[PDB]
Amino acid sequence: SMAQRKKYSVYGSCQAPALAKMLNSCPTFARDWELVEMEPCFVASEEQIDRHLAETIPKLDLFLYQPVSEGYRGEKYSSVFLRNSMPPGGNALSVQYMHWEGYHPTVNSPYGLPPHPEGYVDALIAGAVVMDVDKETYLRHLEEIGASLRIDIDEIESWCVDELKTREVGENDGGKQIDISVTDFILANCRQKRLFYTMNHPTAALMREIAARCMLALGYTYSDISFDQNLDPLDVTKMSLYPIYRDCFDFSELNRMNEYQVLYKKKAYEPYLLEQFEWFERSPKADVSAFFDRVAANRRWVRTALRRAFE
Ligand SMILES: *SCCNC(=O)CCNC(=O)[C@H](O)C(C)(C)COP(=O)(O)OP(=O)(O)OC[C@H]1O[C@@H](n2cnc3c(N)ncnc32)[C@H](O)[C@@H]1OP(=O)(O)O
Ligand SMILES: [Cl-]
Ligand SMILES: [Cl-]
Ligand SMILES: [Cl-]
Ligand SMILES: [Cl-]
């Protein structure tokens, strides 16, 4: 019934609690399923993950999860190890980890550098710092950078799709193919609808879409699927598209590059980008260079933009 709904959990990145929130907002889903919450992979403590292996997972009818490698934090947090503890007759369905750099091709997260309080940094700025390009020069060249990215938009999108398709194979989930994905949807809609606020924070529209695919995988009909349209669980931070590049997107509005939102606060694009320079200049140059090299290695358009703007 209702006090006798089946039990499910959602484990994975920050997208996992967001997906549970979205699913719970569908009355037909909520009629059948009761959430038992699991902390996501980046925050679960050892005590918490131990408890979930012992007490949560063996009681689930459904484990919706994103692939998480053993190398991330250890076996205990890995999707292979967690799903192994499911009871007989339980169902474990993998859900795509949604990552897409196509709106903000200059943005990534620190590797080998201190964590940034906002979680994201502009990697092209890191390259400029290494190249001894001054912050004022960079700010005067935003259009040249955006023009380069615009010329390269198809290459960028092709790579973004390939990264998702490669991950569908599930190497970080013991070689199990990902059950539930939205790759074709993302490519087909990305220029028409804003699908990501940051590379790994889907907007409401994308969260609804993936939640819908989960419901289809569970055997619900298309007509069963409806969500709270006001839910936008990953809206904390909103990266701004660069000038010129932004005009490739149907939704693009204000001010020659929009303000950023970071941790729910608005920040004008000029001070935001100047502060990125200041942040990188605090770290050892060798480490900033290692970071930029790591980002640029498989992202041709990044070095191309730096060269076209600053050579
Ligand atoms: S909801 C956003 C919360 N943020 C995070 O969890 C931090 C960023 N994500 C990750 O570190 C990983 O994606 C997690 C969730 C821990 C899973 O890690 P795995 O070891 O299982 O494997 P991944 O392939 O998911 O991650 C490895 C690196 O690859 C980046 N990444 C994932 N997906 C893509 C796509 N499609 N394109 C490019 N890069 C992608 C991850 O961010 C991660 O980056 P590193 O810089 O190597 O940490
Ligand atoms: Cl059971
Ligand atoms: Cl799809
Ligand atoms: Cl924008
Ligand atoms: Cl060229």
Domains of the chain (ranges; CATH) run 1-104+154-234 (3.40.50.12080), 105-153+235-311 (1.10.10.2490)
| Chain mean position to CA 132 | 31
Nearest CA to ligand 1 atom 48: 111
31 in a labelled binding site: no
Q: How far is the CA of 122 from the centre of ligand 4 (A)?
A: 15
> H-helix or E-strand containing 266?
strand 265-267
Q: How far is the CA of 209 from the centre of ligand 2 (A)?
A: 28
Inter-CA distances, 178 with 94, 143, 189, Å:
5, 39, 21
Distance CA 244, CA 257 (A): 9
DSSP codes of every residue in 179-222:
SB--HHHHHHHTTTS--EEETTEE-HHHHHHHHHHHHHHTT--G
Q: Enumerate residues 6+ apart whose C-beta is below 8 A from 171.
A: none
Residue 18's Cβ-count burial label (10 Å; 0-12, 13-18, 19+) is buried
| CB atoms closer than 10 angstroms to residue 1 | 5
Contact present, 3 and 32 (Cβ < 8 Å)? no
Query: Could you give the 3-state DSSP secondary structure of residue 60?
Result: coil
Inter-CA distances, 119 with 107, 132, 303, Å:
10, 24, 23
Tokens linked to 204 = 């409401």
Nearest CA to ligand 1 atom 1: 14
Q: Which residues line ligand 1 (CB under 6 A)?
A: 13-15, 41-42, 67-69, 71-72, 97, 99, 111, 163-164, 167, 172, 200
Nearest CA to ligand 1 atom 20: 69
121-122 and 107-108 beta bridge pairing: antiparallel
Resolution (A): 1.4
Contact present, 245 and 150 (Cβ < 8 Å)? yes
- Tell me 105's DSSP state: T
294 in a labelled binding site: yes
Q: How far is the CA of 24 from the centre of ligand 5 (A)?
A: 49
Distance CA 8, CA 17 (A): 12
- Tell me 245's DSSP state: G
Tally of residues, the chain: 311
Tokens linked to 241 = 């598209």
Distance CA 15, CA 28 (A): 21
Backbone phi, psi, residue 98, to 5°: -90, 115
CA angle at 225 for the pair 221 and 12, rounded to the nearest 5°: 105
Q: How far is the CA of 184 from the centre of ligand 3 (A)?
A: 4
Torsion of CA 197, 199, 205, 207, to 10 degrees: -120
DSSP codes of every residue in 1-47:
--TT-EEEEEESSTHHHHHHHHHHTSHHHHHHEEE-----TTT--HH
